[PDB]
Amino acid sequence: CYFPLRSYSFRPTYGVGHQPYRVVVLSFELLHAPATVCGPKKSTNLVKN
Amino acid sequence: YFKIYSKHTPIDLPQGFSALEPLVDLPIGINITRFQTLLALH
């Protein structure tokens, strides 16, 4: 029997091989429904006549 | 796609002609085979 639970070693003054890193996985899925979430885009002005 | 076409006008038979306007469009994407109604009580 092996015991899988191990505590974190995380400290900023240790070496390279263990450091805490905040990891965010952005899960993107495109279905046949139209998208309700869009990102911003820079635009221009409006010219008349 | 589920759409709601809403028109309200003042007025056991209706008469006259009017044009309906859209209101709520929700892309739900489910199967609806049957429907019921609701009732207010006092």
From Swiss-Prot, chain A:
Upper taxonomic lineage: Viruses, Riboviria, Orthornavirae, Pisuviricota, Pisoniviricetes
UniProt superkingdom: Viruses
Subunit structure: Binds to host ACE2. RBD also interacts with the N-linked glycan on 'Asn-90' of ACE2. Cleavage of S generates a polybasic C-terminal sequence on S1 that binds to host Neuropilin-1 (NRP1) and Neuropilin-2 (NRP2) receptors. Interacts with host integrin alpha-5/beta-1 (ITGA5:ITGB1) and with ACE2 in complex with integrin alpha-5/beta-1 (ITGA5:ITGB1). May interact via cytoplasmic c-terminus with M protein. May interact (via N-terminus) with host bilirubin and biliverdin, thereby preventing antibody binding to the SARS-CoV-2 spike NTD via an allosteric mechanism.
Spans annotated as Disordered: 32-49
Effect of F3L: Increased resistance to neutralizing antibodies and human covalescent sera neutralization
Range of the intact protein held here: 488 to 536 of 1273
Entry function: Attaches the virion to the cell membrane by interacting with host receptor, initiating the infection. The major receptor is host ACE2. When S2/S2' has been cleaved, binding to the receptor triggers direct fusion at the cell membrane. When S2/S2' has not been cleaved, binding to the receptor results in internalization of the virus by endocytosis using host TFRC and GRM2 and leading to fusion of the virion membrane with the host endosomal membrane. Alternatively, may use NRP1/NRP2 and integrin as entry receptors.
Effect of F3S: In strain: Lambda/C.37, Omicron/BQ.1.1, Omicron/XBB.1.5, Omicron/EG.5.1
Name the UniProt record assigns to this protein: Spike protein S1
Swiss-Prot record, chain B:
Impact reported for D12G: In strain: Beta/B.1.351
Glycosylation sites: N31
Domain of life according to the entry: Viruses
Assembly description: Binds to host ACE2. RBD also interacts with the N-linked glycan on 'Asn-90' of ACE2. Cleavage of S generates a polybasic C-terminal sequence on S1 that binds to host Neuropilin-1 (NRP1) and Neuropilin-2 (NRP2) receptors. Interacts with host integrin alpha-5/beta-1 (ITGA5:ITGB1) and with ACE2 in complex with integrin alpha-5/beta-1 (ITGA5:ITGB1). May interact via cytoplasmic c-terminus with M protein. May interact (via N-terminus) with host bilirubin and biliverdin, thereby preventing antibody binding to the SARS-CoV-2 spike NTD via an allosteric mechanism.
Function recorded in the entry: Attaches the virion to the cell membrane by interacting with host receptor, initiating the infection. The major receptor is host ACE2. When S2/S2' has been cleaved, binding to the receptor triggers direct fusion at the cell membrane. When S2/S2' has not been cleaved, binding to the receptor results in internalization of the virus by endocytosis using host TFRC and GRM2 and leading to fusion of the virion membrane with the host endosomal membrane. Alternatively, may use NRP1/NRP2 and integrin as entry receptors.
Name of the featured protein: Spike protein S1
Protein's organism: Severe acute respiratory syndrome coronavirus 2
Lineage: Viruses, Riboviria, Orthornavirae, Pisuviricota, Pisoniviricetes
Gene: S
